[PDB]
Predict the structure.
Amino acid sequence: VVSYRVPHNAAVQVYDYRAKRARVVFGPELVTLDPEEQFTVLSLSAGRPKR
Amino acid sequence: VVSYRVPHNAAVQVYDYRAKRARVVFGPELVTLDPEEQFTVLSLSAGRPKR
Amino acid sequence: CWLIRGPLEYVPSAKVEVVEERQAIPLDQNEGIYVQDVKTGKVRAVIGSTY
């Protein structure tokens, strides 16, 4: 299984393609992906000034 | 077991993912983690000026 | 093919033949294994108790 422990003040969004269903969960829960669930990996700005 | 002795004027927050339950305890108690409990490790600013 | 399981003893008859050993997998809550049912292809992602 692929499972992620969401931080307390955080949120993760997933989509089950096999079920064609989106769901986003916030807070400190342990999410487990169904066999056709995919995460919303976010690319974010960082660095000293910004990137 | 993983157990932490909280300082007197301190507080630790944990989440049990297997039970999907958050709890934070303050004061000088001995917390013991359930098999799917996780701590809220905090990164904090320190150093001479600040970091 | 079929699986025989339980706290018991077996003698393979002349007709039947032992294919494999099939050791179980111990799983707790918020943990599981991705099982594909090759007879139907569907992937179930069975989680929870041991399986």
Summary: DSSP finds no helices and five strands in chain A. The first strand of chain A starts at residue 3 and ends at 5. The beta strands of chain A are 3-5, 11-16, 21-26, 30-32, 37-39. Chain A touches chain C at residues 1, 3, 18, 30, 32-36 (CB under 8 Å).
